[PDB]
Amino acid sequence: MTLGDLWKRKLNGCTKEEFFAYRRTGILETERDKARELLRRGETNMGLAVSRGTAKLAWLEERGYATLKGEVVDLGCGRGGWSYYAASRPAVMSVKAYTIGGKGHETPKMVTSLGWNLIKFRAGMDVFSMQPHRADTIMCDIGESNPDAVVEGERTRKVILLMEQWKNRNPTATCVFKVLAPYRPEVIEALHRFQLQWGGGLVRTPFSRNSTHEMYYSTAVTGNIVNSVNIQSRKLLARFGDQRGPTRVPELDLGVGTRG
Numbered sequence: 001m002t003l004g005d006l007w008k009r010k011l012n013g014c015t016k017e018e019f020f021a022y023r024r025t026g027i028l029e030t031e032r033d034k035a036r037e038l039l040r041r042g043e044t045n046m047g048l049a050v051s052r053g054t055a056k057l058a059w060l061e062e063r064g065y066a067t068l069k070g071e072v073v074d075l076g077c078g079r080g081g082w083s084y085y086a087a088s089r090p091a092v093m094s095v096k097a098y099t100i101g102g103k104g105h106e107t108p109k110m111v112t113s114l115g116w117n118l119i120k121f122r123a124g125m126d127v128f129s130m131q132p133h134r135a136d137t138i139m140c141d142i143g144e145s146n147p148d149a150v151v152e153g154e155r156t157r158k159v160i161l162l163m164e165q166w167k168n169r170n171p172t173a174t175c176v177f178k179v180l181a182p183y184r185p186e187v188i189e190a191l192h193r194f195q196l197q198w199g200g201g202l203v204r205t206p207f208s209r210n211s212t213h214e215m216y217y218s219t220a221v222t223g224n225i226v227n228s229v230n231i232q233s234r235k236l237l238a239r240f241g242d243q244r245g246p247t248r249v250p251e252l253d254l255g256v257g258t259r260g
């Protein structure tokens with residue numbers, strides 16, 4: 001058993017009120033009052049982030065932790081926050097965004113955020129069975145939280161195998177992907193294998209809630225995987241009993257309009 005396993009069991013034990021006080025204490029959080037309202041309407045003229053995923057990818061890019069260039073692929077785009085972020089970047093030539101949709105899953109929000117015309121959105125697609133194609137940048141933000149850590153580990157292992165197939169198709173491609181449950185032994189093993197072949201390492205986003213152990217793997221970064229995960233596990237374990245609340249920051253506004 002690991003520190004992250006204990007955190008998970010610790011987190012499941014929380015009452016509602018303690019879950020609400022724990023999940024956001026000490027985290028950065030975009031103020032989405034306006035963006036939520038634009039989404040609640042049908043507002044198609046919108047450059048504000050369509051989700052909290054946009055700021056996370058921007059945090060990674062702006063730290064030098066993630067490279068976005070050329071033909072981008074967003075695997076599991078949901079509303080498309082990463083897709084719109086990537087499409088706004090001058091180095092990016094095109095985004096091919098895929099998400100499964102269906103009952104209880106988000107579909108792309110259709111909006112005029114800068115560079116939107118460069119995005120090819122495609123719902124009803126299972127990226128785990130899709131054939132990989134050419135890509136310069138491989139993004140994948142897949143990983144649905146679940147009280148059962150074995151399930152989180154299995155979902156995370158499917159993502160890493162997804163990235164192995166896309167990297168086998170595009171060996172020189174950069175990649176950034178969500179690792180929902182990095183503390184699981186099957187996941188540590190798969191990341192270790194991935195790191196031996198493709199390089200990279202794991203980093204923690206300050207926008208991630210304490211309710212999730214998610215870390216992001218990127219080929220732009222380095223580091224001992226086991227140490228990275230334990231460092232995060234210890235921090236999350238510490239945060240219990242603390243309740244200073246989040247630090248609010250403005251949401252990203254990418255502007256609107258087309259790109260060439």
Ligand SMILES: C[S@@+](CC[C@H](N)C(=O)[O-])C[C@H]1O[C@@H](n2cnc3c(N)ncnc32)[C@H](O)[C@@H]1O
Nearest residue numbers: 051053076078080081082099100105126127141
């Ligand atoms: C949490 S969202 C990522 C958030 C997104 N990056 C954003 O900024 O809005 C991950 C998406 O992947 C989708 N997904 C899960 N499994 C999938 C699969 N097998 N094939 C395609 N999409 C999948 C989920 O429905 C979900 O909408």
